Amino acid sequence: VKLAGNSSLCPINGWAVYSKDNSIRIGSKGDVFVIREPFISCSHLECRTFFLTQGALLNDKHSNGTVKDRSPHRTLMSCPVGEAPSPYNSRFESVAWSASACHDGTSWLTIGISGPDNGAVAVLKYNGIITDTIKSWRNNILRTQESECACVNGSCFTVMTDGPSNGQASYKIFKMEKGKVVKSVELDAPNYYYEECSCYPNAGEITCVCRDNWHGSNRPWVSFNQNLEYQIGYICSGVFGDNPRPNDGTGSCGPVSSNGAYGVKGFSFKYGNGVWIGRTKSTNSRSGFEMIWDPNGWTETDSSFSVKQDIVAITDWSGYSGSFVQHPELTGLDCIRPCFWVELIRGRPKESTIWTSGSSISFCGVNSDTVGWSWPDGAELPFTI
């Protein structure tokens, strides 16, 4: 039976630690994939970590040059949450240098983009079987969420971007059923930029918090129907959520252009007119991580907030982060539970190695006691090489 997606997000007070894979530490000796862009997605029965391999193991010569983003060798694979991604515990999903995945209650939907920069194709699989294809419409690096798609009532939803990463691009929402595109809509969003959306379902409605790589140090959002009727905006809080970003100050409910160029994949959970913001601790680089509760931050422009929960200290590397959700049919709860993962990037460009990889940690929204701390990657670089 299908995941309803009809209930609201659980009330929460903080975030309890959920998983830590220790991947890079283990890959010093173990046969562990070089990966980036990991993400978590759950069904009605399990939770899996999905990741983009570089088709190479850590501490091996084929990990050379793995700071490079796209190659014919990158593949989407998955393993049980909290396990080190290995060729001996990993399920092959798709050939992909950009990906999304989610479960509708019946089967896994996966989305894998591969092919040339000027004509990439998204391959959609339902239960490991190809069901559809989406071809680049702007012939400039077709790219998707790098986190879980959202499912409501047997329909799953995703965002894709095509075009420049330093200017106006083109953004589309896709509605799919059983891995087939049944509807899609291009966003009429002049002056907006959408990329690497973290999307979650909330009472029949999908909310995406994305990355403005163009000219925004605050995060853009889309909220849409099962019909793809949408509203757009930026998070107004002066607690800016992108990286890089300026210091906290007066927000905008447009893009904040200081330190607006570039960015990092992130997420936020809308709670009424309040917002839980996951962001790095550093203003410039992908270092540290904290959760911030800003009770009026969705709509109000000030820089004040109620609650900081430390997750990774500034002295340690972080990276991508994304939302995932746990549905009532898995948990037995009467509400949809918010969770998040953080990718902890090690190696290039910031460190002197021949390789780039990431490990993961994850946390779930909880209505009981929690604590801040640092759960950093913990590997000592460089490696034997």
Add this chain to the structure above:
Amino acid sequence: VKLAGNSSLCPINGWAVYSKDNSIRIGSKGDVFVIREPFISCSHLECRTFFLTQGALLNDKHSNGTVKDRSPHRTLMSCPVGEAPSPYNSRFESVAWSASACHDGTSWLTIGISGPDNGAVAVLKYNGIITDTIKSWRNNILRTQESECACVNGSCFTVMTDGPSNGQASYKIFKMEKGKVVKSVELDAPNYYYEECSCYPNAGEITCVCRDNWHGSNRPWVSFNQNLEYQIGYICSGVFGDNPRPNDGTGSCGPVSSNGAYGVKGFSFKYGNGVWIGRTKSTNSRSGFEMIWDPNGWTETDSSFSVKQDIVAITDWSGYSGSFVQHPELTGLDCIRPCFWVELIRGRPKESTIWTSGSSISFCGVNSDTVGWSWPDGAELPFTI
């Protein structure tokens, strides 16, 4: 319930990337089998890659001399598609230096040939249990498909060859039910040569596209009943599909003798009087790969075609390729879906190593948008050794 095999091949426009195992790249550090002759076969529930190991791991001294084709140590094994063939994820199937495998909807049938050159025996297993045996009848390297057998209505079908590889040999079709031979027929095919057949079911009828190692640079074919009533011929297109081969020119609906000796395992999908040809890009060696749609190529002798889709560039090594199929009972489709795999050979004889192995990529026939590219093996040779 049994795979019907009663429906036709799906209409398609091109090929979407399905899997890439990255085996050789991973085997630089990971515990990965030295293999050749890999192939994919699906049931009603899963798809598996089958392969012939050399009973040795990559980058280990026992991989020495693995260009050699037949030994008592070669075994047929399988793992989930897209995973690197490892002793920790691989299921043992059979002792074999030549093999075939398929699923009738109930159980896996496997065929493993081992024993001496002058008296090899094919061991047939149904659900991992020995059900029959076929002894060499010409005492000269009994050999079979090195790809999936075809199943129609609880009966599975295979081709075997015995005799010289530089002259007339003897060719037999076998019909088996529950892993037992119930009927077989020797082909009355003077001047023809059949080897390494890629066979697929199409509306109750089996079509095999094979390798003429003797004197044909175009590929021979057999099409046969559930009764083993057959017709034979060669593909007429002047787009020649073997390797080695001459340049494209005037085809024959006999063997094209320039560059006819030797060959490579390949495949083709008959679509009316049209043909999808998988072939190497190079005319001499196993380099590159492309799909070609020739709308009249089954019967017409010209060298013109409609559609080239690149799969591997000439600058990269390929090798064997074969058909596999996905039945309605697995996909939910109303038609049988064509797919193919390519073996990407690395090492001897073309490169200076002590070993020979292959990785795999695969693709499925799709009626939506697709793109050409190169998805090559990607390993850097030589290895530590």
Add this chain to the structure above:
Amino acid sequence: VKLAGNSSLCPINGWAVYSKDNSIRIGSKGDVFVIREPFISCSHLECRTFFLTQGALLNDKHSNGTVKDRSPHRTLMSCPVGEAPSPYNSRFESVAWSASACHDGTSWLTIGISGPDNGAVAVLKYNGIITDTIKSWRNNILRTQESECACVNGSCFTVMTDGPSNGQASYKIFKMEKGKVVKSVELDAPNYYYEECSCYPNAGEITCVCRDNWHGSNRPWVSFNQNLEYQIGYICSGVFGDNPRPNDGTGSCGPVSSNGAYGVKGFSFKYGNGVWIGRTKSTNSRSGFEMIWDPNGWTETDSSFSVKQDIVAITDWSGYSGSFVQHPELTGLDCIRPCFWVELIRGRPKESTIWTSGSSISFCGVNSDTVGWSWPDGAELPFTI
């Protein structure tokens, strides 16, 4: 259906060997986790070994400094009993530097404590899903059993300690149902010290044998209701069960203060007014192991006993030991079967390595013939490093 916990402990005469993982021996070459604090827990269908990794493999640089007890990298994981804990056979459970786990007949409950020393949080998971949280109430290293919790009639029970490890601390019993705390009670135990409790169910009643780290060389005990109505005491036998301890002499039914400070996790099985004591052979260090039947030792103060069964010789290292139980619904027996495991610690502080790890052996209570022997760790130190 739920584990009843309503039957009594089986009559037994001795202990039959059950498992040996050979972990450290294998981890000399194999990819094996550095672990400590392992323990066994069974469901109605299987038995699993749980352990606290250091997020590092044996014989790798990240095993450096692993004598250290608590870090953000420590995780609770599990694998089938008797298997070497590897990233390729291990299931991720929780982020934790102190842990407990048990099965109520329906799902696995796990308890993982992580976070800072001055504010650690216990994360409770039911079926891998977070169900509750317990925050440190004395802000001084919240810590739990490091063995299985006890389940009676769909309710599971655990003990936690907070406060100093060289003085009076605070001790609480928790009753949980489906991974949620429904009741808890603080023990009014002046002059007592409770830590690392080994708890087992006996006819609807839970008995814990614990570690007095403060001033007791005999072991303290709690016995409690499904209502958390309790009685407390120390084991009276002059066969002292902690390490360190004095030589056997006149017991107390309070803490025996010679050699009372520090301690080791241990266990005992109450059989009427008799007791089966698992203890080290050495009086000072964690060396050797023996089972002792003292038919009056629960209540009587003498140092005489009936039966020594050797398990590990004094010349070999042991460490932690704990109780586990096998319920009728798993075994088909009419009684609850007592079993125990021993952790065999190797490396720091006693040996010159950069690392500390442990392997495990286990034994089950049997009413047939048994034999004493030595089943030691068997690794030769140091390692390559």
Add this chain to the structure above:
Amino acid sequence: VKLAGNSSLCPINGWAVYSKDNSIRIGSKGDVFVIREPFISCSHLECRTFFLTQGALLNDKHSNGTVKDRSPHRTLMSCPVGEAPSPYNSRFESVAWSASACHDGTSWLTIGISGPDNGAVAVLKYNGIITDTIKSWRNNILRTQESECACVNGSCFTVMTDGPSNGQASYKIFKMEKGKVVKSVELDAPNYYYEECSCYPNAGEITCVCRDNWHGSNRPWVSFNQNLEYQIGYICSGVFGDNPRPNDGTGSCGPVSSNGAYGVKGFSFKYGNGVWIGRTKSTNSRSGFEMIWDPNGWTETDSSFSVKQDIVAITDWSGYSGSFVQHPELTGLDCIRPCFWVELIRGRPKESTIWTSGSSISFCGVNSDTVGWSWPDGAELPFTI
């Protein structure tokens, strides 16, 4: 439902190759256990290889001295047939330096002997749970089959030996149900010696072919009821089946004393008054292997036979061999199928290594065409060490 064991052995003409694990070849690089005494046993659903590890991996320092037979570190483990025994694919069964195992249709029974030479205990497990114990009655190396036990009608049967290995010992048959001994009988066999019995069921009757280590170069046999009513004897053929042995000549229906001392574990299948003999090719050492059909060899004393099928050449090492069986409920056949495995020993004492291990090959009885060949171990010694 229980394995009946009520049908007869299938008619056969020869032996078709079934499995080859290539263990030692793979263990040169892969994480593979050092093992000896492997054996195969099947249920109604699968076939598993059982083996005695030395708690150490190949090509690691802990493999030193593994020619030694008995230690506290030896464990019984199992994996799917034809797979290399690894800590990542192996299930832990029992602590044991001598073992037996079989499946009654419901659960796995395992028998593991460990403990001191002068008081070893057999631990019986049903479904991985301890159900019984057998203590040494002669206090001189209690030892069992090192192959599968035989099951008839929910009862399983085994042979054990206690006493000297160069003189009269004591031999017992045990009948067990659900892993519990319900009956046992000591054989009144003066001048006979029984060890390492290969036992199989045939129409409600169990036949064991064993090893006379004392003074027999032909093999002893026991045939017994479900009641344990027995007959004893030696195989009369002048085709002697032990190793060492004299050249073929005039048999005895007592022990043939030339070259009678020592021996090797072997097997034979009784077919009326005929016999299929598995034996080494060499008369002195464990080299080579062949199957011999002697149509009158059970009862007649001559050295003539009808059919030699080569399995391993004299130039290659063999070792232990044993019977296993495949029951109708697994195969769908109307008869019980005979199969055998051969252990291929490498290293000490015959080769200069610090270690001893074995790989396995196996074969099944077939009523179709077969072929002789050599399927040897194939590892090149010595190793890195």
